[PDB]
Design a protein around this ligand. Structure first.
Ligand SMILES: CC(=O)Nc1cnc2ccccc2c1
Ligand SMILES: CC(=O)Nc1cnc2ccccc2c1
Ligand SMILES: N[C@@H](Cc1c[nH]c[nH+]1)C(=O)O
Ligand SMILES: N[C@@H](Cc1c[nH]c[nH+]1)C(=O)O
Lengths: 406, 410
């Protein structure tokens, strides 16, 4: 016997499991369409060059890479997106809103991640729309603002604090990667020291993450500080769109990725049971680091397929969806198969989903099968009715003319 | 600059290219739904064990395989059927049969990458399986705008060649390699030479050659008899496709065997009627595969694969792939930034009603917002101006410009 289990850390999706994944992906697609995003894709195999950011990101540390040329199964999509945008150059109409549902990889070693990104929008209206899109998808899955929310912050506050301590800007990214981890405080404090931060700088960093309102941020760095102005705009806009109950400020949110420059956010369950449901932020330098002659504003998020499903299971929002089909055509016997095929054809021409019983079996077993596959309707093709130009129809029984079947 | 081009042999799908791929995949999904097939998936990374059939198949020769840090032999799948077999084998007697499963996996080779619609029927002994599969393939092609004048499906049974090979005293273990070789018929001299190395005397090769060049089912009947399984089965097959209404799409070709070791009965492949392209799709019955994998009971199977590259080229030639421009129902335009919060309330209402709507995100003049709306293929522009708003209205323009109440917008 071969190994029936999949490769370590990877999932199978037989029809039952696939119906669940499809229910999720439908929402992702429908939400992207509702928001005017365009689908894109790129290869799961990318060059390893793409992912060498040197900030000690967990995402790059756990990279599923190998030698053919140094390549890797993508751990995230954003770098692939950047490559595509960079390739298009001035030919790309901006603003652009691009989305995808890539499988992404790590050495669970795989997950699907809905990505949504807005390109060419300087203003926080980008982050507003992205955050509303994430909420929209969660609400579409049956979740409420009682079940989940999105925590929101700007990295610019911490930037100012780090810069005011005389820290080289090249340490800012690593700092964020470290502060994201806050493991015990003592552990995070120790890691900052290794980067080269004296205890006074660490204290200032700590204090600002524990500030509980935007007003308190304003008191520390000023009301005219970009972060304050931008965050206020952000909440004003989400309030106006009608999702004010879904969003809130949290000064501890920074995310683990090196490239976020401004607003950052993450979805969470209100019971404190699960890891982050989605995460993202503004990354206005990324394309400059890739060699764009002109800076290109960007913001986006990723929304994994594993945590959301667990949450939905806990909330009883993932009932088993049984397979369905409109009609099952049953030949009374093999002499009726050619006539049943003509009927089957007509049913499918009218846009119905139809089976015909393929192997040899008795009518009552054909009916059982029809129930098993969730047929709405059983269409028996018997010699008696056929001579009258009819078939027997049974809902899940009466004679019907062929033209009247559809 | 980083390298903007993708890894060697792999494709990018920016929105324009992705719309084309989506148009194709929609047809695959719709056809599968129309035929009552259920979607499935499995990992693109499988164990290399799965693909070691030892018949010299082109598919296994060109395998994109590698060793993990932990020393396990894995490969990016070159086809889906082995993954399917694994899933079925894993389910055991818990699987209701018959089962009709489909997927659109990306598959890989060392172009190194393509998408391949797979459709398979499990648990059906009779040729009704192959009938349905073939009709499904035709159905997808017709849905894409192709006719029976543009394409067809060549059909054969491997059982004819089986009988001929067995009657020459050939060990059954050579039958699979023979099919793999005969599939290649490169020059005849080249294929003749390869059969000799497997260990076939020229008389056996001659018999093989002759049967592939037989041009009708009657001629096959003359050679192996009218009551031979192959003849009976092929006749049933054409009778059934004729009855379903796709008789013009299908025909017999004794040279079709396919390159895969595991096909045991009927085999088939789609082709363009102008002789310009490689095979559009291919498949057949493979009744032993699950037994080779260790199933305690034999499990009838048949299926096909339908790649995404050749079909698209054909559709381009036939002018059936016009550029589909992106569309969206509404573009909401704030007259200025003071109107953004009101435009957001409007945007919200539009999306609540199931419409696809943008709001202009950055700061720009109305006329530029209108241009943008045209660029993204907006059916409708919804201007939110301070004047109309005090009346409980907005300006709507179709793509002139009339005032409308908010509740009437949807
Ligand atoms: C719990 C889980 O499987 N999620 C997950 C989260 N991040 C990943 C990142 C890369 C590859 C696989 C990943 C999988
Ligand atoms: C035109 C094309 O790329 N066809 C093709 C056909 N078979 C394949 C099999 C595996 C990977 C890529 C493949 C690509
Ligand atoms: N790539 C990020 C999410 C994201 C997409 N776009 C911007 N951010 C992640 O994997 O967490
Ligand atoms: N795996 C086959 C197609 C197929 C699927 N099922 C049966 N046949 C191929 O790649 O040619």
């Amino acid at each position: 016997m071969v190994e029936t289990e999949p490769v370590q850390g990877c999932r199978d999706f037989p029809p039952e499991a696939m119906r669940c994944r499809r229910h999720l992906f439908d929402v992702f697609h429908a939400t992207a369409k509702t928001f005017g995003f365009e689908e894109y894709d790129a290869p799961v195999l990318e060059s390893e060059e793409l992912y060498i950011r040197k900030a000690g990101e967990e995402i790059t540390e756990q990279m599923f890479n190998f030698i053919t040329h140094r390549v890797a199964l993508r751990p995230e999509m954003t770098p692939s997106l950047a490559r595509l945008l960079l390739g298009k150059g001035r030919s790309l109409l901006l603003p652009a809103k691009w989305y995808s549902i890539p499988q992404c990889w790590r050495y669970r070693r795989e997950h699907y991640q809905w990505n949504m990104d807005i390109v060419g929008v300087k203003s926080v209206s980008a982050e507003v729309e992205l955050v509303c899109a994430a909420c929209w998808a969660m609400r579409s899955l049956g979740l409420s603002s009682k079940d989940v929310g999105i925590k929101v912050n700007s990295r610019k506050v911490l930037q100012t604090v780090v810069e005011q301590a005389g820290v080289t800007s090249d340490k800012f990214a690593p700092v964020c990667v470290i502060v994201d981890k806050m493991i015990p405080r003592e552990e995070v404090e120790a890691q900052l020291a290794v980067l080269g931060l004296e205890p006074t700088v660490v204290d200032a960093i700590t204090t600002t993450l524990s500030l509980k309102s935007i007003d308190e941020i304003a008191q520390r760095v000023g009301e005219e500080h970009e972060a304050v102005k931008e965050l206020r705009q952000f909440f004003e806009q989400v309030e106006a769109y009608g999702y004010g109950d879904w969003v809130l400020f949290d000064a501890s949110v920074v995310r683990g990725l090196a490239y976020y420059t401004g607003i950052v956010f993450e979805g969470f369950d209100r019971e404190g049971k699960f890891r982050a449901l989605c995460g993202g932020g503004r990354y206005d330098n990324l394309l400059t680091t890739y060699g764009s002659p002109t800076p290109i504003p960007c913001a986006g998020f990723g929304f994994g397929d594993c945590v959301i499903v667990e949450l939905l299971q806990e909330k009883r929002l993932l009932p088993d969806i049984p397979h369905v089909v409109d009609d099952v055509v049953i030949p009374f016997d093999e002499s009726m198969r050619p006539h049943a095929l003509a009927v089957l054809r007509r049913l499918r021409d009218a846009g119905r989903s139809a089976d015909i019983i393929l192997d040899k079996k008795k009518v009552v077993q054909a009916f059982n099968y029809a129930d098993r596959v969730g047929a709405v309707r059983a269409v028996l093709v018997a010699p008696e009715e056929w001579e009258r130009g009819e078939v027997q129809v049974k809902m899940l029984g009466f004679a019907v003319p062929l033209d009247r079947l559809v």
